[PDB]
């Protein structure tokens, strides 16, 4: 759920899911037209394609566990969905942070309008 | 306060708060349920989610002051509050700005029924 996933974002990057990933780029504060405005964004855009491949699963709602394990994302055993979300939210968070040097602000409150298009996944 | 987010809005997007933006979709006013509905209704779902970020506060009532410098929101300084309230309210206004293009009359006093999911933040 959005709960696990927000504070997994705070965690890794030091920023608070809302302001700094909210409405970012085309995909971040869910989107989904476009081409990715940049690497932060490129990882909104996976995060999508990874919430996409879960047709059986409540991905914004399903509260999973996962703990923290010598400072890695570990997610705890549950069912096939509360895993595969969680591993979703992993590497979405994981990714926020390494491109954490090229987050743009230029970028926040960007007007979806400006994206135009459908890219496959 | 209110007062102040009223403000921005007519500022901003030129319609008064109150109609235009207080019983529009599933979130844009107090009801608070289902999925957000468009672009204008998620612009509110991250608004009341950001309030949520704000226990400490009560962003309701305590009065802040912004300003415009170069046409630009800036929230003028005082409290921790008044300043995160207002960062809440200035990012709510213009993302009801960057969307009045799809925004649409067929989600005003949009029926309960019709909000679907189970959505946390
Ligand atoms: O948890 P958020 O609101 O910061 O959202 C990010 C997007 O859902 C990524 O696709
Ligand atoms: O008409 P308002 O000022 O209550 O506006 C929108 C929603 O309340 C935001 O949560
Ligand atoms: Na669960």
Redesign the pocket.
């Known amino acids: 759920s959005?709960l696990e996933?927000?504070k997994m974002?705070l965690e890794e990057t030091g920023k608070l899911?809302?302001p700094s990933?909210?409405s970012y780029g085309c995909?971040?504060?869910?989107g989904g037209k476009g081409t990715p405005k940049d690497a932060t964004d490129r990882c909104?855009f996976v995060?999508?394609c990874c919430y996409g491949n879960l047709p059986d699963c409540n991905p914004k709602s399903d509260r999973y566990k996962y703990k923290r394990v010598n400072g890695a994302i570990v997610c705890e055993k549950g069912t096939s969905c509360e895993n595969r979300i969680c591993e979703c939210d992993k590497a979405?968070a994981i990714c926020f942070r390494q491109n954490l040097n090229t987050y743009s602000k230029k970028y926040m409150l960007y007007p979806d309008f400006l994206c135009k298009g459908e890219l496959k996944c």
Chains 1, 2 share one sequence.
């Open positions: 959005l996933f927000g974002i899911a809302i990933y909210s995909y971040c504060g869910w909104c995060h999508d979405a």
